[PDB]
Design a protein around this ligand. Structure first.
Ligand SMILES: Nc1nc2c(ncn2[C@@H]2O[C@H](COP(=O)(O)OP(=O)(O)OP(=O)(O)O)[C@@H](O)[C@H]2O)c(=O)[nH]1
Ligand SMILES: Nc1ncnc2c1ncn2[C@@H]1O[C@H](COP(=O)(O)OP(=O)(O)CP(=O)(O)O)[C@@H](O)[C@H]1O
Ligand SMILES: Nc1nc2c(ncn2[C@@H]2O[C@H](COP(=O)(O)OP(=O)(O)O)[C@@H](O)[C@H]2O)c(=O)[nH]1
Ligand SMILES: [Ca+2]
Ligand SMILES: [Ca+2]
Ligand SMILES: [Ca+2]
Ligand SMILES: [Mg+2]
Ligand SMILES: [Mg+2]
Ligand SMILES: [Mg+2]
Lengths: 352, 54, 438, 422
């Protein structure tokens, strides 16, 4: 009889995994503070990694990689890409970014203005976006004065990156979108990409001559369902799945989702996770880790994929909870604690 | 990667390698604590013997 | 030449002390009877090994050691053991009933009545020293004597020897080899009162030693003898610089200068490699790069924690055997480009390296295989704070219900000492976080 | 040289105590005449804990036999190992206690208690370093219950810093001699709450059910019950009688709160006469934690374990022992309090009991023990509310107020257990 504890009541993903674990008749849930557990569905913040793997005779496994925040933090990701040789400062798939601390607190203010003045003098599109992790708090502008002044009015670290002025627009609608990919990394550091992705689409026509109205520029599911007037017009809940998206790319662009986009997504996922493997791997550790990641990509009109951010505690599409959650139990939990296909994942092989 | 202070002898050697530059209670006081705890033990035992005498 | 006096308190300290002096004698060529044929100065001398051994007119090399325990059964092992002839009776001190795993009993009740006798015996060893450096104190965290009496002795040593350094070898409690439940109380109580009296403390987690014995030595259920032989190897690695010619860590003061920039953060992490089973058909001899790289693996650390998520304040590499600086520097270069080694900004990013050409000595019939080169890395990482957090958490669980507190109050300790000691530990955890996290 | 002084009082106390010395004398190689004839040094390593060494290499149990009537101690002196006891250590009267706690504690017992203390003082004066005392007795009678707790009170007055341990037989209506046993037991329990460091609770009903249901004894006798107690007493004292202990250390690690020091013991195997079959470690562990193998007649699944101590005896896989023990905990952690980390401890002894390849003794400090005191409390109140049978006690000088206070004290103890069970 295996034992596990639940320490994040707000996680919809692991509320389902916990529901499935109990359904097998071979997993027992304990009080959240009971140390005699096999599996910890840990809290998001301040997970006590130091108390794991010190129980005699208990193989303990946790659903977060200690140190993965470097990848799942706005400012952190920027610094990791620029300072890591595996990614280098010339990384071709990450928008030019800069870490900017509010003046009320290193900082890249001068470096940003140097590249900004360069674009302004070269007639090039010079639209940037300011954002941070403390947001629900986003500003899109073509003037460096507004971007910097908006950050000083706040009190947390922000990042300024180049705004993709040439996105790929679906038709009909002429609308922006982003792609969410779920990636599961197990205790052996196998990288599993969920075969099912989701496009969170904007239900409003993209307008490049007005960044004040952020409803057609931010493809967030919450912004579309709160400040958009065409929510659910083209697809249910502004969510287009790969089957429909691939059929569209064939009809309009005479190409496939695998060739034009998925190859770049798989490459980017590998690059990001292999980079930090030496720092977060639990191969020789007294406890074991696995974690579910949510990668967010942007596609431009040239069919080039850009990485936007990485989410360490992601949610799933309502239609895909059962399949993905069961897959988490199969490859992440049962692989360590077996029970008494055609995998739903795509293994991204790599050199450890 | 600099090596400084290399010292060698018949039984070994030592050195320093730099990869990057940087960026009480007195005796009396202890006697009181010991005697204080001893007094508390005496008080507790005195209350036990009082309890037993009752 | 400056002398060092070793003090062994409680069962853990005494049994580890017995294992170390056995190893010291094999390393220095001293026979069980105390004779040392290679020593050509009969009845005297100021050689490096004299820091740990005095000499009689008859040529006996006597350890500068005191053994203290509140029950005689463990020290009786020394009196009738292989090396019984090394010590004289004045050096072995035993009471008749122990502290019953009760810090308050070892410190107050029993400690008050034996402290003056222990100081007298230590004073006699001190009177044999021309220039005493200080003391090496071996004890457990969990035992009533190792915790309670050690903290009292350390307080008095600071009074009677104000200008002398004091280092510790402390056994951190592990449930896999302990039948006690109150050890978190004793560990925290003794750390609070000992903190300001110890210049540098090497913690060894029985959990880590236990798992190494199972993993590397293929011992299904390691005993105290197996644990202590491995621990004595690490202790020997650390004290070798005091007992042999050399220029690194030549006196106790240098341990603080090299390993402890901030006084309260004086708990270096020890890592040792290689540990090879003697029963093996025959092992492939590891290179300098391999054993050096092994120093950054959690599996061979004396305390299980993740240095990848802390900051280094100092790092010492102590090699024994066939090693030359060329290979060490090449190995360090390779590891920097592969490992997560982040120093604090107010400390240079470097390594102090010591090499002793004599390879590790193995006790005949022991579990450890003879290797041609071994290394012990002493690094001051904030990652060892994981060990304090674990211990403090067990304390909090029991103290919230005042479980077992009556045993301590019953021996004359005030309940407020618990909270006072606990708040000091919370402050220690805060210090580690201010130095390690951004 | 950590000596223990053993005291056995009353009929039950002397009959169980006699069998105890019979069992361990065999384990240590001491024959009925006190001469050693073993073949292992482990037998004499700690022999002085329970035995004195006399002239001619003779070993004499450090035991004091007490009773208010001669009958039972005449039987011991004539029994199997009767000649091994020190003749001077038989202290007995003639009047009897009439299953009357007041007679044992206040009248008949008071007249004899000083001579008993003279023998205790004599045995202690010859101890290099006295660990403490252990008393065997029943709570349902007069001498063991009333005079036994009187002895404990006077021993604590004279040896206030020594450990006081008892093996206490708790009465049950299913195995009863008189209807006043709940009166005598309630009066004794309060004395034990105050003046003992550890009390092993032995319920005669549990011993009976084990003999009837598990051992398949059609008509169990007191002798059959005492066989289980002997085997259990030998198992719980293995920690003290062989290398690997100390009464104070055990108490420090078993008793988190001073008044909650009442333990449920258990033994395995308990085989009916399929008696030669080898018993694996999983079977030993499963049975030892099985309620049917426990002797307090309390379902552990009704309370929570504060601390647990298991002692395995015999040549076996200590690695496999850890795997099965860590399996029972990590498979039923709902019955262990989570605020005492690592509160389940295990110990192995190489010397097995006579006629067994291996065995396991269980020592649990469980809040489920409150059910035992609840039953006693209910039977007490059923009679006391009508003042039934009180004249036996008021005739000895007792007042009803002392019964009301004993009733309140035990209901306080029950309430104290209940708060830690939640
Ligand atoms: N590594 C190692 N640990 C030991 C040894 N002996 C005891 N320990 C550990 O020390 C702790 C128990 O404390 P002890 O040193 O035995 O007790 P003590 O210092 O003699 O004090 P008392 O309570 O009076 O007996 C437990 O955590 C044991 O695991 C030993 O020989 N080697
Ligand atoms: N450089 C850029 N160019 C174009 N669009 C961008 C952009 N950066 C962000 N966006 C838009 O912002 C939206 C989400 O922004 P971001 O992901 O930084 O905030 P967020 O993290 O709170 C949402 P989530 O965590 O769910 O992905 C995306 O839908 C994307 O269309
Ligand atoms: N297990 C066991 N219980 C006994 C024995 N003799 C008496 N009892 C129980 O002890 C109680 C009677 O007390 P007893 O010892 O005879 O009275 P005492 O001689 O005055 O101390 C009743 O609950 C009996 O069931 C015995 O030999 N074995
Ligand atoms: Ca000499
Ligand atoms: Ca000092
Ligand atoms: Ca009379
Ligand atoms: Mg986000
Ligand atoms: Mg001891
Ligand atoms: Mg009777």
């Amino acid at each position: 009889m295996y034992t596990f504890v639940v320490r994040d009541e707000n996680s919809s993903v692991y509320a389902e995994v916990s529901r499935l674990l109990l359904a097998t008749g071979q997993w027992k849930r304990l009080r959240k503070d009971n140390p005699r557990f096999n599996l910890m569905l840990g809290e998001r913040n301040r997970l006590p990694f130091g108390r794991l793997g010190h129980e005699p005779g208990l193989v303990q496994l946790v659903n977060y990689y200690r140190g993965a925040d470097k990848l799942c933090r706005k400012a952190s990701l920027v610094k990791l890409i620029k300072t890591s040789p595996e990614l280098s400062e010339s990384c071709t798939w990450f928008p030019e970014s800069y870490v900017i601390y509010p003046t009320n607190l290193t900082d890249e203010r001068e470096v940003f203005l140097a590249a900004y003045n360069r674009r302004r003098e070269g007639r090039e599109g010079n639209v940037w976006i300011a954002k941070s992790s403390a947001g629900a708090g986003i500003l899109i502008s073509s003037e460096a004065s507004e971007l910097l002044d908006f950050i000083d009015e706040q009190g947390q670290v922000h990042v300024i990156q180049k705004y993709l002025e040439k996105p790929l627009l679906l038709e009909p609608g002429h609308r922006k979108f982003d792609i969410r990919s779920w990636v599961l990394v197990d205790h052996l550091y196998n990288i599993y990409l969920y075969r099912e992705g989701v496009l969170r689409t904007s239900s409003e026509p993209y307008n490049s001559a007005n960044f004040q109205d952020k409803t057609c520029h931010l493809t967030n599911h919450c912004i579309q369902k709160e400040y958009s007037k065409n929510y659910g017009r083209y697809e249910e809940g502004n969510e287009m799945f790969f089957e429909e998206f691939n059929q569209y790319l064939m009809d309009a662009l005479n190409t496939t989702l695998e060739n034009s986009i998925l190859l770049q997504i798989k490459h980017i996922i590998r690059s990001c996770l292999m980079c930090i493997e030496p720092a977060i791997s639990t191969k020789h550790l007294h406890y074991q880790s696995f974690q579910l990641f949510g990668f967010d990509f942007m596609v431009d009109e040239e069919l080039k994929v850009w990485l936007i951010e990485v989410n360490g505690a992601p949610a799933c599409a309502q239609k895909l909870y059962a399949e993905l959650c069961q897959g988490i139990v199969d490859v992440a939990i049962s692989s360590v604690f077996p029970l008494a296909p055609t995998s739903i994942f795509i293994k991204l092989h790599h050199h450890h | 990667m600099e090596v400084i202070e290399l010292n060698k002898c018949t039984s070994g050697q030592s050195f320093e390698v730099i990869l990057k530059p940087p960026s009480d209670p007195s005796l009396e006081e202890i006697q009181k604590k010991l005697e204080a705890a001893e007094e508390r033990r005496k008080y507790q035992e005195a209350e036990l013997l009082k309890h037993l005498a009752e | 030449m400056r002398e060092c006096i070793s003090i062994h308190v409680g069962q853990a300290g005494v049994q580890i002390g017995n294992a170390c002096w056995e190893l010291y004698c094999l390393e220095h060529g001293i026979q069980p009877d105390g004779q040392m044929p290679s020593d050509k100065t009969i009845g005297g001398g100021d050689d490096s090994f004299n820091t740990f051994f005095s000499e009689t007119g008859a040529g006996k090399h006597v350890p500068r050691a005191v053994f203290v325990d509140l029950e005689p059964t463990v020290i009786d092992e020394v009196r009738t053991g292989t090396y019984r002839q090394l010590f004289h009776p004045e050096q072995l001190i035993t009471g008749k009933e122990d502290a019953a795993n009760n810090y308050a009993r070892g410190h107050y009740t029993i400690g008050k009545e034996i402290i003056d006798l222990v100081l007298d015996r230590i004073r006699k060893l001190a009177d044999q020293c021309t220039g005493l450096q200080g003391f090496l104190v071996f004890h457990s965290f969990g035992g009533g004597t190792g915790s309670g009496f050690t903290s009292l002795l350390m307080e008095r040593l600071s009074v009677d020897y104000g200008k002398k350094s004091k280092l510790e070898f402390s056994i951190y409690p592990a449930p896999q080899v302990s039948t006690a439940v109150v050890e978190p109380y004793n560990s925290i109580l003794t750390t609070h009162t000992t903190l300001e009296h110890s210049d540098c403390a090497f913690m060894v987690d029985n959990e880590a030693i236990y798992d190494i014995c199972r993993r590397n030595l293929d011992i299904e259920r390691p005993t105290y003898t197996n644990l202590n032989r491995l621990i004595s190897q690490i202790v020997s690695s650390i004290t070798a610089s005091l007992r042999f010619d050399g220029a690194l860590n030549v006196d106790l003061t240098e341990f603080q200068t090299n390993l402890v920039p901030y006084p309260r953060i004086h708990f270096p992490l020890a890592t040792y490699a290689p540990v090879i089973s003697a029963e093996k058909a025959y092992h492939e001899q590891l290179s300098v790069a391999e054993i050096t790289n092994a120093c950054f693996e959690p599996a061979n650390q004396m305390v299980k924690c993740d240095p990848r998520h802390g900051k280094y304040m100092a790092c010492c590499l102590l090699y024994r055997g066939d090693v030359v600086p060329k290979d060490v520097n090449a190995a360090i270069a390779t590891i920097k480009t592969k490992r997560s080694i982040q120093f604090v900004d107010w400390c240079p990013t470097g390594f102090k390296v010591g090499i002793n050409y004599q390879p590790p000595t193995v006790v005949p019939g022991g579990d450890l295989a003879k290797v041609q080169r071994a290394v012990c890395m002493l690094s001051n990482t904030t990652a060892i704070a994981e060990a304090w957090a674990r211990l403090d958490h067990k304390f909090d669980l029991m103290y919230a219900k005042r479980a077992f507190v009556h045993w301590y109050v019953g021996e004359g300790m005030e309940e407020g000492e618990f909270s006072e000691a606990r708040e000091d530990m919370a402050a220690l955890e805060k210090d580690y976080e201010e130095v390690g996290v951004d | 040289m950590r000596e223990i002084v053993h005291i056995q009082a009353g009929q039950c106390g002397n009959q169980i105590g006699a069998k105890f010395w019979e069992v361990i004398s065999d384990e240590h190689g001491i024959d009925p005449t006190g001469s050693y004839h073993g073949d292992s040094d482990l037998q004499l390593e700690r022999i002085n804990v329970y035995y004195n060494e006399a002239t001619g290499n003779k070993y004499v149990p450090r035991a004091i036999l007490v009773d208010l009537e001669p009958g039972t101690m005449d039987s011991v002196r004539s029994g199997p190992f009767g000649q091994i006891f020190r003749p001077d250590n038989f202290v007995f009267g003639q009047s009897g206690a009439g299953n009357n706690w007041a007679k044992g504690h206040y009248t008949e017992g008071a007249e004899l208690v000083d001579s008993v203390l003279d023998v205790v003082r004599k045995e202690s004066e010859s101890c290099d370093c006295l660990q403490g005392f252990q008393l065997t007795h029943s709570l349902g009678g007069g001498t063991g219950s009333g005079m036994g707790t009187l002895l404990i009170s006077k021993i604590r007055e004279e040896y206030p810093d020594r450990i006081m341990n008892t093996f206490s037989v708790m009465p049950s209506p299913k195995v009863s001699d008189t209807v006043v046993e709940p009166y005598n037991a309630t009066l004794s329990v309060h004395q034990l709450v105050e003046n003992t460091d550890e009390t092993y609770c032995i319920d005669n009903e549990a011993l009976y059910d084990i003999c009837f249901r598990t051992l398949k004894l059609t008509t169990p006798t007191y002798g059959d019950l005492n066989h289980l107690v002997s085997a259990t007493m030998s198992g719980v004292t293995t920690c003290l009688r062989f290398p690997g202990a100390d009464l104070r250390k055990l108490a420090v690690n078993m008793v988190p709160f001073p008044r909650l020091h009442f333990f449920m013991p258990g033994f395995a195997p308990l085989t009916s006469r399929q008696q030669y079959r080898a018993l694996t470690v999983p079977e030993l562990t499963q049975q030892m934690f099985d309620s049917k193998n426990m002797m307090a007649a309390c379902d552990p699944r009704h309370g929570r374990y504060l601390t647990v101590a298991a002692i395995f005896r015999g040549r076996m896989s200590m690695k496999e022992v850890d795997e099965q023990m860590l399996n029972v905990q990590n498979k039923n952690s709902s019955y262990f309090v989570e605020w005492i980390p690592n509160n389940v401890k295990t110990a192995v002894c190489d010397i097995p009991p006579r006629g067994l390849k291996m065995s396991a003794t269980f020592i649990g400090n469980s809040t489920a023990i409150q059910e035992l005191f609840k039953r006693i409390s209910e039977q007490f109140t059923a009679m006391f509310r009508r003042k039934a049978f009180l004249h036996w006690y008021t005739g000895e000088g007792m007042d009803e107020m002392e019964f009301t206070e004993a009733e309140s004290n035990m209901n306080d103890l029950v309430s104290e257990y209940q708060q830690y069970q939640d």
